[PDB]
Amino acid sequence: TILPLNNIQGDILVGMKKQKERFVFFQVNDATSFKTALKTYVPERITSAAILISDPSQQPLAFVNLGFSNTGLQALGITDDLGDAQFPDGQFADAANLGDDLSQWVAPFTGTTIHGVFLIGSDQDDFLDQFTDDISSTFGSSITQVQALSGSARPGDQAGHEHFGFLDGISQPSVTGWETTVFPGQAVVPPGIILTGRDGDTGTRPSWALDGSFMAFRHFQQKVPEFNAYTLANAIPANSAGNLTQQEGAEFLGARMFGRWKSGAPIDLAPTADDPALGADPQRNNNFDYSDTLTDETRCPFGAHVRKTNPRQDLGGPVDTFHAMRSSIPYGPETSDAELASGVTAQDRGLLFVEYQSIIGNGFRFQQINWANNANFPFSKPITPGIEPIIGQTTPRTVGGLDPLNQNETFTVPLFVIPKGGEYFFLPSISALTATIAA
Ligand code: HEM
Ligand SMILES: *[C@@H]1O[C@H](CO)[C@@H](O)[C@H](O)[C@H]1NC(C)=O
Ligand SMILES: [C-]#N
């Protein structure tokens, strides 16, 4: 198979990887007018995977992708069943299943009023704003913006790190069907794990859904002073290499919870001390599979974030089914010295989380429910893994094995990641946007 890179919305396969990103959530007021606008908007603004892999000199100043919710498709008279079990009812209806405290959800996510989302990526606020205004001007009264969420990469040497301080965007699956660099330890999967209607997709798709994908969008608020305070209060006293200062034990505890140091160094490779050079090297920072630690937790806890969401050899070998692409961006201001000192969040900050897969229930939702929320996953371990400390939602939020020298000790971890809303979207192919959606 040869993937038509010019026809696939770029954030799905390649990722915008821009310093700024805005999500404009909208409702359709006038289907006919919206469709008319779409036919001129799409060819001019919707960014393909082919554009994203081009030299920067060949790229526009901002990228735009576009997804629709179930109610958005219904509002546009697009009535064919896309074959996904969760997409039709929307994410609010699924939130309890994910483990969400529904009382923390906020409008306009508390229902299915949202019809779609424009995602705009740019390296600068000016261009982001201009392309946002271009949407407002092009579509006019045919849509109503019901929310806009804006994110930004963190400053300086924290660029690419999320708000707890950890380098993000290291490990992604690679799909066959196009020419790309594959790093050591990177999963290689058929394209239909990500793209609807391609090899590996087992869902029943309308023909027009070929080369689309489903986005699981999550708006997470993060409690950074609280996380920091918790790591200090529960600092690991020692590891194999020797005794730790409190600061060292706190840093180590954070790395044990994630499965990576803040630098990106995976603990399975660097189990006792950070290796920042390793973290920054894509030829090495993903080259592990837990095969050296299947039945003990010295090198990595069973319930660490990355291990829960991608179990690697904990599944007994390579498995295609549960991989997904991520294209998230942090939002909010840096955490001040006063905030960290108090141990109390004073400002709104977090992660605008984006995960793509052909089958919602096998990607995001499997990682969340079957794995992160499941105290007995990974399976067949000598010590109960417990609840994934970062995003596991089951209470009590108890996780074992964080202390490599006292692996039977359990940690009850306050929730530092608060879901504020989210939605399930379908991003069609570029041709489908104009030939089907706008028909
Ligand atoms: C605010 C919430 C979250 C934060 C701060 C966070 C942070 C991180 C970090 C620091 C990494 C390591 C970088 C990497 O390996 O690429 C990571 C990896 C990952 N996360 Fe999250 N994450 C969050 C939520 C989620 C959720 C909700 C899911 C899915 C249910 C998820 C799934 C994954 C996956 C699949 C990986 C890559 C694992 C691998 O391939 O080894 N994350 N995350
Ligand atoms: C390690 O810490 C313990 C206290 O937990 C202390 O008794 C011991 O002397 C320390 N060892 C070294 C080599 O500093
Ligand atoms: C995880 N992103």
Q: Compute, in degrees rounded to 10, the torsion defined by CA atoms 359, 74, 88, 192.
A: -10
Q: Strands 325-326, 238-239: parallel, antiparallel or unpaired by DSSP?
A: unpaired
Measured from the alpha carbon of residue 323, the closest ligand is 1
Largest CA distance in the chain: 69
* Total number of domains in the chain: 1
The verdict on the CB of residue 220 being under 6 Å from ligand 1 is: yes
Does 400 appear as a known binding residue? no
So which residues are the catalytic ones? 168
Contact (Cβ atoms closer than 8 angstroms) between residue 240 and residue 181 = no
CA of 182 to the centre of ligand 1 (A): 20
Q: By residue range, what is the domain housing residue 31?
A: 1-439
Tell me how the structure was determined. X-ray
Instruction: Return the exposure string of 354-393: e unless at least 16 CB atoms fall within 10 Å of the residue's CB, then b.
Output: bbbbbbbbbbbbbbbbebbbbbebbeebebbbbbbbbbbb
305 known member of a binding site: yes
Gap between the Cα atoms of 262 and 228, Å rounded: 13
Does 243 sit in the ligand 2 pocket, CB within 6 Å?
A: yes
What resolution does the deposited structure have, in angstroms? Answer: 1.5
CA-CA-CA-CA torsion sign (53, 58, 62, 64): negative
CA dihedral 120, 125, 130, 136 (to 10 degrees): 60
Rounded (10°) CA dihedral 43, 46, 52, 57:
60
7 annotated ligand binder: no
Q: And the tokens for 124?
A: 């600068």
Separation of 413 CA from ligand 1 center, angstroms? 17
Ligand with smallest separation from the Cα of 357: 1
Mutational pocket test of ligand 1: of 390, 394, 415, the residue with most ligand atoms within 8 Å of the beta carbon: 390
Report d(CA 73, CA 183) in Å as an integer: 38
Q: Give the count of beta carbons closer than 10 Å to the beta carbon of residue 108.
A: 17
